[model samples]
Target: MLKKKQLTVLDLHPGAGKTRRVLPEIVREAIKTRLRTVILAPTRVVAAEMEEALRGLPVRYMTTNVTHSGTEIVDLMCHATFTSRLLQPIRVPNYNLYIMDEAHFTDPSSIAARGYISTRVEMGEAAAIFMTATPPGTRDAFPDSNSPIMDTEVEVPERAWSSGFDWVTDHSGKTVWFVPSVRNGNEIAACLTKAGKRVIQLSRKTFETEFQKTKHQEWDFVVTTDISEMGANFKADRVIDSRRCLKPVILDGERVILAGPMPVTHASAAQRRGRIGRNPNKPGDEYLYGGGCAETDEDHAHWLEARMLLDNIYLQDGLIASLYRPEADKVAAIEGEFKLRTEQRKTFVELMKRGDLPVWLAYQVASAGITYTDRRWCFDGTTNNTIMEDSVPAEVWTRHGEKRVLKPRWMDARVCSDHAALKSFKEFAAGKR
Candidate 1:
């Protein structure tokens, strides 16, 4: 696919370590074939991680908008940054090779998707690669791309994991418990610290520099949130993946929510499980297997056990032994929840688009990904802060308390990040009731 002069789509597992293994060959092949490479990531953190992963290779790479002159440099640009410059923008180093990581982030009205394709298809670049764990299960989602060099068939093997609380008690090496929210991470760190365990917490505020500090510093345990997602890998003995909660956060307005709005599924339950069992000192074939943990449901026992057999037997990790969810069990839980989330968002956007409800609700679905966030939704709507905080961060909610209502960026195009959002803004701009 890298050698071909046509677009390629790959749907791979989120934490399968495919990028670390596959990126070098792709880049080397691109360079040998004289096709300049640019790998586009959804976030700056992802781009930086990709840059670091490729550091050992002979080819030089940049994690910035600027690609080096006179050198076959691999430009790693964040999607948000690149999308901003999609129109009549920088005529910088022309790239024949493009690799888009986390392409599952392309929602129905995603500008990043449009921008990524606009710059490429507008110029008619044939050789490109799109990678994601859960593809829309459709190639035409990207209308602009030429007929695929290869169809969107991606075979990714799942990892084995040992989860739940007591699994940690059996472990001898250092442990890191991955939690659902920022609150849980810090709370876990505090409890461990009180018990005389030296630990540190990593969150959204914790940048690239701070993470390295934890690596070098003297701290036996580390707890972190999922915002770094699963790509930010650090070595640990065992992990507790709290990616799925027993009771999900929801704000039900009494309704039948039709499904299919959310199509892309990030292998979150599997990826967070990878945070542990990665220690370079161990043998490469070493891995974390199962049977100690109980299945959430006896109904899905056969499918779950068979799937676990597939992961444990076929897949094994040398550096990290991640104890993940019983493949089919967690699949039902997460997929069911996402199905509800998509249906929920669909109901909300439908009411909102009809001008029956406020646009801020649809904006919430726009800002948030597949993960449900009705808690933040109510908070944003209560204070009419969603308007002000849509473009700005939620710090405005706390920075200026209940008494103070800050101003929103009324004229910002970025606030209208999606096409559905643009409709509301166009109506707002025209003074239409």
Candidate 2:
């Protein structure tokens, strides 16, 4: 038997190489132990990446299959069912062990948390190790004594200070712009093209290859969607946003706005600021401009308020803080409402008393309501009331289905609300787009 003390510790550095190295070792360990492992990740892309990493080990199982079907992997005997058949019962002939790739998401309120609990109950006697660059909420949810793996640290090489690149020479140091609509993005792209610059527009479809192509060839500048936020890494000496780029771009070297509505979140703004002066070889200036759809003073206030809530939850919860660190005051301001600091404990107790609604369902309801209220249903591409209507049936089904009562009040409210919330939540959790 392999003693717990004897488990090998592998030190991995950040970036793609580390993932490549650690993945195979994890698979090797699973094979050695004859364990059935379940891997979970925050995003479907990440989960699918891990699955692909496992394919090279030459390790295959007859009774079980691997997939990115649900929040977590479900391994069972072959006679039972395929990977896509979620929630199906399958007989297990032997013991299994689970490996949660991004284990920091074990909080009771998180969808990942509920998925882990459900898997644990079904698997029985399975052990899990949650791995991530940043492990948030682990200390709070599980005590050190009973935690899965008691804080394993591996030293990694420090990243260098600079990647030499030019900031201003491109496009004659043209001002970067931000536009709010697809129409705006096209207009900007057309303008740059007419200016005789090697312009590229990075939408969701073209982001990956465009990113790769940009590295090989010198482009005057690039126009991209939110893809640059997290997945692909590029050393753009200067970055621009008509709309706010995802939270990560805030860390890039040049932050510029051509023309568009300004972003509301302090964290986003901070990240945008960070993007500037990253390349020590060539520092760049950050600018913000406004034009097109003008936001009202009230719109800005509400925007700021909403941002505060998101930032606070991220900071207080720790999971979000590590990935997207929020400002202290920003985090504190929304504490009571977002962090559940005011009556969160009581609210959670009530929710628990109400029989613990599934985390997935909860997110669906909450996100839809918030989206509808804020964007007037614009975020969802539908009317706010319409999204509310769709959310009703699911809410009714969730609340009253157990009793088989099918209350009309519940159904009436749910049907009256737009279904966007239910659809959005499902899309979010299930890794749709």
Candidate 3:
């Protein structure tokens, strides 16, 4: 009988593993209360992992059931389902609790967050718990006066780790090789397969079915896209990233070097390195080789500057918001622009609260100058000014017309902050002139 107003956020440090510790406890309590729980994640892989992690708990587990699809009742029997598909009104099951993982993604604009909110509204009277290392935007998604049932924060000092990646050579006496392109990736996968090494190749096409099919197979090596960017656990002792991939591999306080002709941008390089050193298992190592490519110096520099912005500010906020109020409107807006929707807004008020703006009031201001008449006053996309102006509603045009368009208000505040960080990083990358 917990209410929406009773829901609260559980914030913790990045990589603190607090969710890992608390989730099981929460699930057990929910089951004891006969509460059906729904968990949402930005990606199917993440949702699948969360579902699997909770499989052995005392509560009954449900997975991938398309009950509305009329697939079968048996499929819908599990206590959990990992789906990004927005649950329609008729399809939603009454549940006692909703747990949004990477919850900061909720914005009225996000499809997934919207689905969760819609279901919440329809079901009513359920406790929603948001968990993440980073909070989405600067403001809390829900107002403090709204009667949050419980609020908690956990700190784990050992969670702090380096953000950069360095090249590592040793593979703990295991065979480690680098492939440079999609061609090389396939060839290497083939070679490994032929050599009796269990191999898996992950690409953008991978979905839940494919992941489930391959995840358990005995694979000596797994080649995948940045899908392994987060806490992806693998049985393989050695990991490799093709040179064609711009991402880096972090392992045991070092990064994998690139082999062949690939350009590694700074931010991706850092993420790649972060992947390494994940578990304290035996010391880990990464390998990379590089080939010369003809990218412009300015582009390379900009990419490096962008990476600095991502690591220092953007990622922290993005991850936090994704965890706590995954369905907060502003957070959803950013994720939506990227086509990643795990939540949506229930009302316009939700949007304003999430964005830290006066609800309905800002809309009135933004709608002022918008004229459907001739569209003559519209800004063009050729310049940064147009880009900023267009981000605000057409009505706001008059107010901002003469004013210098310093920033795009519709641009996720985190992204705007990240851009500021990039400006500073660019100067630093240029030797801080």
Candidate 4:
């Protein structure tokens, strides 16, 4: 019954009946209001389950094999489909309401979908609800302080994956183990089965054939991948998570360098725990097993913030400027874009000063092509004078699996009062060209 003009977060706990209780009601409301609504699921399996849950309702369950029927009020599709269609907005079905289910699973396909959704909320073009059992660990995910969030008073789950193997051996009830990979799941399943207990292994390899086998028969344990984490319903007395899953958090130290998995976030730990005690009717012991689940790092959040701020500038000042012309008709749009860039750059610099973003990362992403020394301001991209171009050195993480220290051609400087000059310099350079 609420109408949100900006992005809103519904932070419900696991077993809070978000999918069974709240989702149907939202669809009902959409039907009554005749507002076109699209439900974005993280995976195809979950999307299909949501459609089945909404059986008899008017929903177009979209897939590669199927096209839109155009008669349904709600459209359910995986994030992949949404991202593909959004590249060309006209090819997509514009909806008044967008419900992003399992919103915590960052899209591996593209960050642009998330960026576009944020942009839609910012422009008041559509109302968005980022519904997730695992809420964001930082405030950077939200549009602003005023953005609405529906939170519950559920107790935080205890982390215990460090003792996963020991807990499984000692416990005497039905268990579900969320392993990192297919190999891990298979090895664990074999080990558990060898102990004279019935075990089932589920993964992409066996998901289609063996998923239903779990529901039909009772088992001592079920081992699976992250596929089970994303809205897969099953009865388990406890969840033993290995702190590894299908999706890994990439940690590129400085730039987009290659790096290994850092750690899972608190949000992920909660999701793993939520798997247990989900069935309120047959409430099981909520014993969560996972340890060293890292606190949600601020790097990705800061990177996203940088991306959002520099988006228009990257397009207008960099991409579009190179491709398009500055005729009289296009002059106003270009100037307005510049003004927005100027304003956003100031905010970006303010965030850097507050240490929201690391110094090296801030400079790398901003790419403003100007910097300052202890004496005078320097312009690196276009200059009329002769001076050495200095660069702020970055820490070497890994490149093609080897550590090679390097720095950007553009120099990084402390925040200066003359950011507006960078904009004027760009305009002058463009005009000179």
Best by lDDT: 4
TM-scores for all candidates: the values are: 0.50, 0.37, 0.40, 0.58
Q: What lDDT does each candidate get?
A: 0.42, 0.33, 0.36, 0.52
Between candidates 1 and 4, name the one with more favorable TM-score: 4
Q: Is candidate 1 or candidate 3 better by TM-score?
A: 1
For every candidate, C-alpha RMSD to the true structure in Å: 15.8, 15.9, 17.2, 15.0
lDDT of 2 at 41: 43
- TM-score-wise, the better of 2 and 4 is 4
Q: Model 3, 1-433: lDDT tens per residue?
A: 4345356566653334544667767776666665657655545566556656666554332543222332211111211122212221125554556666654332222223424343344445556766654343323211221111121112211111233221222123232233333344566566556545666665433533455545556545565554444345453334444323432222221112222244433323233333433345445343232322222222211122122111111212234113223322212123322221212222222223332322222232233333222222222222332222225522223232343323232221111222332343222212222
Of candidate 1, the 10-residue stretch with the lowest lDDT total is 142-151
Clashes of 2: 28
lDDT of 3 at 232: 51
For candidate 1, write residues 1-433 as lDDT tens digits: 5644555666554444556767766877776667777777666667666766777444444444344456555666765444323212245455677777765442222222333343353346646776654443332221211111111222211122234334333445565555444444556666566656678777544544467766687776667644444356566544444433211111142111122111122233334443433343442211232212222322322232222212211111321111122121233322112212335444444433343333333433433452232222323233332333345432222321332232232222232333344444434323242
Kindly state the number of residue pairs that clash in model 4: 4
Per-residue CA lDDT of candidate 4, range 93-114, in tens? 6677888888776433223355
Q: Would you list the clashing residue pairs of candidate 4?
A: 160-290, 161-289, 161-290, 161-291
TM-score of model 4 relative to the true fold?
Answer: 0.58
Give the better candidate number (1 or 4) by lDDT: 4
